[PDB]
């Protein structure tokens, strides 16, 4: 991102960098394995659902 | 502020350019006061002295 | 995120995308599938701040804008030639002088 | 041309601007000279050739 | 007359914007370059 | 393109912006009183020119 | 690159690139909603990561 | 206190209750005060105007014209710099007679 006052880019690094969203999938990955559906809960204003994955 | 002259000035209009004229104005006003051109923190082995 | 120190290049487009994520709705109303849109105009009234808009520098203002028609005024009438040139591109006239606009109209486009 | 490249001085109508600005006045009349001043004289453009 | 006319072309390269006329792209890439007749005959003779 | 500074209309024609601008002082109420005398005057026979009767 | 296919216009109409019309965010709207939890995490595992986060 | 409120005149903040103005939240970080009674302003640098003028009843147009060469000065990114008035195209009689017919509803 441009910056109007520094006439320059950003050096904040972008995506492939952060332990937050790789661990995120990975425990979503192996929370849920090879079942096919994949996100560990559901948000519902009629409640939360869970995966029936045993671990 | 003589090309901005050129600029009619009935037809203002914000470009960058227009911030940064007013950038540069306001760091000459900062850097024409009299006290922060001899203050500096940091000792030079004779001050300390 | 105002109130605190964050990077403003990237704390607003972030806020462009979750203001825009929040927008739709997908009702259950009765015989029809009804879509409630809100532009990013309502948004705009409440103070988040634009990034390039007619054509304009990116980044033009800042998010110290009042959330109302204070802050609506302000940026509007910071731009207001460059929208009037805008206005005239894609041809939007009528020869009534507006003293606000001039020959360029408002009411079809806006 | 060849006399507005040599030349010394330096032409800004701001001088005026600046002064007239700080006459005095009482802005319920019909009229106070120094509107009337920096309308006939309407010095915003150089172009002084 | 200082005036503005209403162009067509959309490019900057330093900043990577797309603008209005080429009236003010130029200037804007000029921001990114500061910051960081017998009558006739006789004249002529 | 030509853009005056009242109004902020935009023309194509620089003689057509001067036009402009001459369409374009002192009290709003004095203008007011012009106008409508200018009105009131603008269209008697005595600023106008241009069978029976024994 | 997915989310770059259905967002083509739109990420760079809020990142200062392309002028920010209507349009555009309310298709960005549109592709907002019409989609699912497993389309979630496959735009997660599309992107890669370089060595410092893992 | 009926009697006192018609002659005192009032803070510039009194005012925006009128046109159902309010400082908004972002500001009370920054010293606004300084800003609305010493820098925006009228009586421009080019001098007076005839336009730029305002009746000596009903100067409570004063506060208000603060208020939003306060908020233009202020929303556009840079040093918030010093603004003045560039003319207001009806006169201070005809806007705040604008002003009044507003508030002759609630």
């Given at each position: 991102?441009?910056?109007?006052?520094?006439?320059?880019?950003?050096?904040?690094?972008?995506?492939?960098?952060?332990?937050?969203?790789?661990?995120?999938?990975?425990?979503?990955?192996?929370?849920?394995?090879?079942?096919?559906?994949?996100?560990?809960?559901?948000?519902?204003?009629?409640?939360?659902?869970?995966?029936?994955?045993?671990? | 502020?003589?090309?901005?002259?050129?600029?009619?000035?009935?037809?203002?209009?914000?470009?960058?350019?227009?911030?940064?004229?007013?950038?540069?104005?306001?760091?000459?006003?900062?850097?024409?006061?009299?006290?922060?051109?001899?203050?500096?923190?940091?000792?030079?082995?004779?001050?300390?002295? | 995120?105002?109130?605190?120190?964050?990077?403003?290049?990237?704390?607003?487009?972030?806020?462009?995308?979750?203001?825009?994520?929040?927008?739709?709705?997908?009702?259950?109303?009765?015989?029809?599938?009804?879509?409630?849109?809100?532009?990013?105009?309502?948004?705009?009234?409440?103070?988040?701040?634009?990034?390039?808009?007619?054509?304009?520098?990116?980044?033009?203002?800042?998010?110290?804008?009042?959330?109302?028609?204070?802050?609506?005024?302000?940026?509007?009438?910071?731009?207001?030639?460059?929208?009037?040139?805008?206005?005239?591109?894609?041809?939007?006239?009528?020869?009534?002088?507006?003293?606000?606009?001039?020959?360029?109209?408002?009411?079809?486009?806006? | 041309?060849?006399?507005?490249?040599?030349?010394?001085?330096?032409?800004?109508?701001?001088?005026?601007?600046?002064?007239?600005?700080?006459?005095?006045?009482?802005?319920?009349?019909?009229?106070?000279?120094?509107?009337?001043?920096?309308?006939?004289?309407?010095?915003?453009?150089?172009?002084?050739? | 007359?200082?005036?503005?006319?209403?162009?067509?072309?959309?490019?900057?390269?330093?900043?990577?914007?797309?603008?209005?006329?080429?009236?003010?792209?130029?200037?804007?890439?000029?921001?990114?370059?500061?910051?960081?007749?017998?009558?006739?005959?006789?004249?002529?003779? | 393109?030509?853009?005056?500074?009242?109004?902020?209309?935009?023309?194509?024609?620089?003689?057509?912006?001067?036009?402009?601008?001459?369409?374009?002082?002192?009290?709003?109420?004095?203008?007011?009183?012009?106008?409508?005398?200018?009105?009131?005057?603008?269209?008697?026979?005595?600023?106008?020119?241009?069978?029976?009767?024994? | 690159?997915?989310?770059?296919?259905?967002?083509?216009?739109?990420?760079?109409?809020?990142?200062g690139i392309t002028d920010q019309s209507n349009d555009v965010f309310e298709n960005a709207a549109k592709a907002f909603s019409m989609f699912t939890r497993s389309d979630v995490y496959k735009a997660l595992d599309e992107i890669p990561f370089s060595e410092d986060?893992? | 206190?009926?009697?006192?409120?018609?002659?005192?005149?009032?803070?510039?903040?009194?005012?925006?209750?009128?046109?159902?103005?309010?400082?908004?939240?972002?500001?009370?970080?920054?010293?606004?005060?300084?800003?609305?009674?010493?820098?925006?302003?009228?009586?421009?640098?080019?001098?007076?105007?005839?336009?730029?003028?305002?009746?000596?009843?009903?100067?409570?147009?004063?506060?208000?014209?603060?208020?939003?060469?306060?908020?233009?000065?202020?929303?556009?990114?840079?040093?918030?710099?010093?603004?003045?008035?560039?003319?207001?195209?009806?006169?201070?009689?005809?806007?705040?007679?604008?002003?009044?017919?507003?508030?002759?509803?609630?």
């Open positions: 991102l441009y910056d109007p006052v520094l006439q320059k880019y950003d050096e904040i690094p972008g995506l492939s960098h952060n332990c937050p969203l790789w661990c995120f999938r990975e425990i979503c990955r192996h929370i849920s394995g090879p079942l096919p559906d994949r996100a560990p809960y559901l948000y519902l204003s009629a409640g939360v659902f869970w995966l029936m994955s045993p671990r | 502020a003589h090309v901005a002259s050129h600029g009619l000035h009935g037809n203002m209009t914000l470009t960058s350019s227009e911030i940064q004229r007013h950038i540069t104005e306001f760091i000459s006003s900062w850097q024409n006061h009299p006290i922060v051109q001899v203050s500096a923190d940091v000792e030079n082995r004779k001050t300390a002295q | 995120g105002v109130h605190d120190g964050l990077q403003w290049q990237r704390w607003i487009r972030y806020s462009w995308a979750l203001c825009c994520a929040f927008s739709r709705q997908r009702t259950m109303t009765g015989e029809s599938v009804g879509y409630l849109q809100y532009p990013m105009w309502s948004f705009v009234y409440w103070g988040l701040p634009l990034v390039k808009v007619f054509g304009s520098d990116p980044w033009i203002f800042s998010w110290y804008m009042p959330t109302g028609d204070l802050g609506m005024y302000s940026w509007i009438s910071l731009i207001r030639p460059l929208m009037t040139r805008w206005m005239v591109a894609n041809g939007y006239v009528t020869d009534k002088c507006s003293p606000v606009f001039g020959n360029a109209d408002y009411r079809k486009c806006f | 041309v060849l006399l507005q490249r040599i030349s010394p001085l330096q032409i800004d109508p701001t001088i005026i601007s600046n002064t007239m600005s700080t006459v005095s006045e009482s802005t319920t009349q019909t009229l106070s000279p120094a509107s009337s001043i920096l309308g006939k004289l309407r010095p915003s453009n150089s172009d002084f050739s | 007359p200082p005036t503005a006319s209403s162009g067509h072309g959309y490019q900057c390269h330093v900043c990577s914007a797309v603008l209005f006329s080429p009236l003010d792209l130029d200037a804007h890439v000029a921001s990114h370059g500061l910051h960081g007749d017998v009558e006739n005959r006789k004249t002529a003779q | 393109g030509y853009q005056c500074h009242v109004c902020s209309a935009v023309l194509f024609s620089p003689l057509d912006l001067d036009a402009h601008v001459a369409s374009h002082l002192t009290s709003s109420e004095i203008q007011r009183h012009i106008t409508e005398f200018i009105s009131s005057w603008q269209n008697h026979p005595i600023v106008q020119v241009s069978k029976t009767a024994q | 690159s997915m989310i770059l296919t259905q967002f083509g216009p739109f990420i760079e109409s809020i990142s986060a893992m | 206190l009926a009697g006192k409120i018609m002659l005192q005149d009032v803070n510039t903040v009194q005012l925006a209750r009128v046109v159902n103005l309010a400082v908004p939240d972002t500001w009370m970080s920054l010293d606004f005060d300084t800003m609305f009674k010493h820098h925006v302003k009228l009586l421009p640098k080019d001098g007076r105007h005839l336009n730029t003028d305002i009746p000596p009843r009903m100067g409570w147009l004063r506060a208000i014209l603060r208020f939003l060469g306060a908020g233009m000065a202020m929303t556009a990114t840079g040093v918030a710099v010093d603004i003045y008035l560039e003319d207001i195209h009806g006169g201070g009689r005809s806007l705040g007679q604008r002003f009044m017919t507003w508030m002759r509803q609630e």
